[PDB]
Design a protein around this nucleic acid. Structure first.
Lengths: 121, 68, 56, 233, 251
RNA sequence: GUCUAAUUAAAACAUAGCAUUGCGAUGGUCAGAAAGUGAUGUUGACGCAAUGUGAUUUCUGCCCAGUGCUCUGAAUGUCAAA
RNA sequence: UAUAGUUUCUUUACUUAUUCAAUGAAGCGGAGCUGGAAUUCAUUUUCCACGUUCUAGCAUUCAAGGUCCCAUUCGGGGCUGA
């Protein structure tokens, strides 16, 4: 019998049956619980007269927050813990090393109502 | 036995057959990498003098080093 | 700028002509003419070689 | 039909972007390919010494099929039949107490290089087969001279993988027969006479003759041109 | 004593070439099959200035015979070449200026440039402005072509070697004085760091062999052997003669 | 135009211009302990490297004994290892 | 002066060692068709070319065509074209 054909003088690596893993056992044997749940993204509110002017007039909550957290997490955590809906989120890093979050709701809910529901004011 | 024949024949190194064989195998080793695997040895007589038992867990690595 | 050339429409970036927003009209005219003419001249070269080689 | 036309393109030098051809000849192969190819090439170019190219005079495939049919008759056993053999032997030693001879004597092919060499130096062998494809050739270069000095008939055959297929292994590098049944000893003698005419008798002259010295196609063509032009008369 | 300037020049952190504005390496088309069996047409699309180089360049464009592709090359322009100009490269090509004929295809007294001394080097000898190579004669048997090189020298190369016909552009460049350290400054600003040049005889003896003394003077001779070493080689290397040139070179 | 930052801004250095030298790429100059390593070099003598003199005008004289550089090799010269 | 042997050295020759360079490793070498030159002293020796040059266009889809299969159907493959 005669040989195969070849159009290009390049010889590339062939493709090859790439198995996957389902190997025999597990790497850690225990799925770690949620590193970042609502009860960890939200540490405590903030109650400085500035932020209280905010929550009174601007319909804005002000929270102190983990440095590992982001706005999606914060929004979902608030929607869960406080049974609200949240318009937008502006975060910063307080130079004491912490994170702070200004959290604006819809005009439906009232931040004063839910804050003196929580039990700070 | 054959390893005895092999040992004496490998001692006859300036014989024509072995210096030819040497010429060839050095060409091909030199065309290969500097440290390169061998899955079987070249002198089984010798590897057996030294400890090679042809089973799982023994490995040959052919290696060349500059000279002088 | 070249991403505003994305947000704008096909009408702004092109003309109704072959080789629209890529080549000048006059260059188009030139290469049209050149195409036609040297195709005809290649035909003429072909038939000259034809009749010559057929005679000889 | 009237819409189909004949364009035909001119694949010459300045025209008609060239088409797909078979460039099997102009490939950048990898180093392992290049190495084995140039290796065999070099090992024919060089003036090989007679005790090599004592190989490369192999056995024609007809008598090869004959001898391999014979050896397949005198094939060794596998693990399953060995297992049931010795189960029978256990039964017989238990009930009849046959002293390890309830089983018959086996007739089988002898494989193993040092096995075979001692078999030869003791002269228990009837026939020897030797593979040519051996990578350390030193393992086998002596076997012919030894077989001659002993007076044993040997043969060089194609396929150490073939011997392995025969003998249940992957390779064997060697094979030999020492004891055969009378049902086949005569074909054995015939085959041996043929072989001894092919290999054993020509030992002296092949031992004399140097091999190799062969050139490529381009070079042999050039030598032909040069030589006929020089001997032009 | 220190390591001196000519020795620092070889590591070359600052002495490397200033290779930014250079349009590419001005090499010939590759010698594949069309060139060595027929010819092939490209087009000079644009002539441009190369930085550090007094001879211009000519962005020529060809076609790929193996693919729908437009491999563009860079040629050093000869005097007479212009835009839109068809360049014919190959063996059966015609002998007009800008073409890339081989030397077995040209006759004697022919004037070429950007020549190869080994076929497949893609461009060598006669690459600078105003310079040309002259063919002298042939030895087709033992296919070899004698050529005169601008030095005044004689060389013998494969008649299968290539070369553009004509003389390199930009000629007469050094017929003009600069008048100005600033002109020189900018020239070398684009070439490399070899300007300005201090004199060893004005240096200190730690800095140069000619240096030191209570006058600027050399002391020993400025003619050094080729069997000298780095740090000894400051002056006239291996000079056979010396001084003003009183007559014919006699080469 | 530049330099002796923190005692010397100059007649010093540089400069264009002049001249000489080596090199046709298996190369010249230079680097690296070495290397299938590098700078010049995206280079190719109207070029690279090394030196000296120092705009222009006008001239650059005699000396190859000595010291260097170099070109020659037939030689009762010398002359290492092998 | 001719010798069968060993010998040194000079020159020359070969490529696979080694070295150099290039490329996406594309067209190597030999032979063969065609045409031409070619003089043949039977019958062919050979040798040359073996698709592109007024022009700043264009050239791509396993190639269109020719031919043979399948299973018509949407089509699909092969050889040639090369």
């Amino acid at each position: 019998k005669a040989l195969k054909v070849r159009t290009s003088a390049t010889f590339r690596l062939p493709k090859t049956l790439k198995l996957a893993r389902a190997p025999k056992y597990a790497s850690k044997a225990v799925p770690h619980y949620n590193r970042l749940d609502s009860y960890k993204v939200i540490e405590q509110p903030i109650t400085s007269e500035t932020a209280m002017k905010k929550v009174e007039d601007g319909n804005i909550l002000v929270f102190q927050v983990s440095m590992k957290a982001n706005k999606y997490q914060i929004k979902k955590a608030v929607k869960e813990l406080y049974e609200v809906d949240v318009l937008k989120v502006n975060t910063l890093v307080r130079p004491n090393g912490t994170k702070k979050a200004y959290v604006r709701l819809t005009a439906d809910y009232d931040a004063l109502d839910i804050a003196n529901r929580i039990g700070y004011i | 036995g054959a390893y005895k024949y092999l040992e004496e024949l490998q001692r006859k190194k300036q014989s024509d057959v072995l210096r030819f064989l040497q010429r060839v195998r050095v060409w091909e080793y030199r065309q290969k990498n500097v440290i390169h695997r061998a899955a079987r040895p070249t002198r089984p007589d010798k590897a057996r003098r030294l400890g090679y038992k042809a089973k799982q867990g023994f490995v040959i690595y052919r290696v060349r080093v500059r000279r002088g | 700028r070249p991403r505003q050339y994305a947000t704008v429409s096909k009408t702004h970036k092109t003309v109704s002509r072959a080789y629209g927003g890529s080549r000048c009209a006059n260059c188009v005219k030139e290469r049209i003419i050149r195409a036609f003419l040297i195709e005809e001249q290649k035909i003429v070269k072909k038939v000259v070689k034809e009749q010559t080689e057929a005679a000889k | 039909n009237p819409l189909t036309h004949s364009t035909p393109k001119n694949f010459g030098i300045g025209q008609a972007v060239q088409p797909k051809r078979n460039l099997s000849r102009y490939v950048k192969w990898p180093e392992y390919v290049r190495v084995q190819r140039q290796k065999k090439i070099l090992s024919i170019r060089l003036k090989v010494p007679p005790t090599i190219a004592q190989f490369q005079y192999t056995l024609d495939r007809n008598t090869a099929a004959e001898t391999f049919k014979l050896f397949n008759k005198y094939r060794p056993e596998t693990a399953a039949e060995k297992k049931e053999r010795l189960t029978k032997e256990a039964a017989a030693v238990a009930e009849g107490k046959s002293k390890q001879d309830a089983s018959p004597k086996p007739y089988a092919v002898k494989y193993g290089l040092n096995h075979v060499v001692a078999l030869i130096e003791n002269k228990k062998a009837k026939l020897v087969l030797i593979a040519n494809d051996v990578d350390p050739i030193e393992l086998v270069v002596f076997l012919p001279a030894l077989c001659k000095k002993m007076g044993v008939p040997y043969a060089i055959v194609k396929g150490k993988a073939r011997l392995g297929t025969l003998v249940n292994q992957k390779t064997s590098a060697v094979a030999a027969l020492t004891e055969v049944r009378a049902e086949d000893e005569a074909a054995l003698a015939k085959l041996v006479s043929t072989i001894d005419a092919n290999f054993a008798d020509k030992y002296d002259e092949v031992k004399k003759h140097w091999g190799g010295g062969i050139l490529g196609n381009k070079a042999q063509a050039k030598m032909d041109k040069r030589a006929k032009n020089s001997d032009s008369a | 004593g220190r390591v001196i300037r000519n020795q620092r020049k070889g590591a070359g952190s600052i002495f490397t070439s200033h290779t930014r504005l250079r349009q590419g390496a001005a090499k010939l088309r590759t010698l594949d099959y069309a060139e060595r069996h027929g010819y092939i047409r490209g087009i000079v699309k644009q002539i441009v200035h190369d930085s550090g180089r007094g001879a211009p360049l000519a962005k020529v464009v060809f076609r790929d015979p193996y693919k729908y592709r437009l491999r563009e090359e860079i040629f050093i322009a000869n005097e007479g070449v212009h835009t839109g100009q068809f360049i014919y490269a190959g063996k059966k090509a015609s002998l007009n200026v800008g073409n890339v004929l081989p030397l077995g295809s040209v006759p004697e007294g022919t004037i070429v440039s950007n020549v190869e001394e080994k076929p497949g080097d893609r461009g060598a000898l006669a690459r600078a402005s105003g310079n040309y190579v002259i063919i002298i004669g042939h030895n087709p048997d033992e296919n070899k072509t004698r050529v005169r090189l601008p030095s005044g020298a004689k060389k013998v190369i494969s008649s299968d070697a290539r070369g553009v016909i004509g003389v390199i552009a930009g000629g007469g460049r050094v017929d003009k004085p600069l008048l100005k350290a600033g002109r020189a400054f900018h020239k070398y600003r684009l070439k490399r760091n070899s300007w300005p040049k201090t004199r060893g005889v004005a240096m200190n003896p730690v800095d140069h062999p000619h240096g030191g003394g209570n006058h600027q003077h050399i002391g020993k001779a400025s003619t050094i052997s080729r069997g000298a070493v780095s740090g000894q080689k400051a002056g006239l290397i291996a000079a056979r003669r010396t001084g003003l040139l009183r007559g014919s070179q006699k080469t």
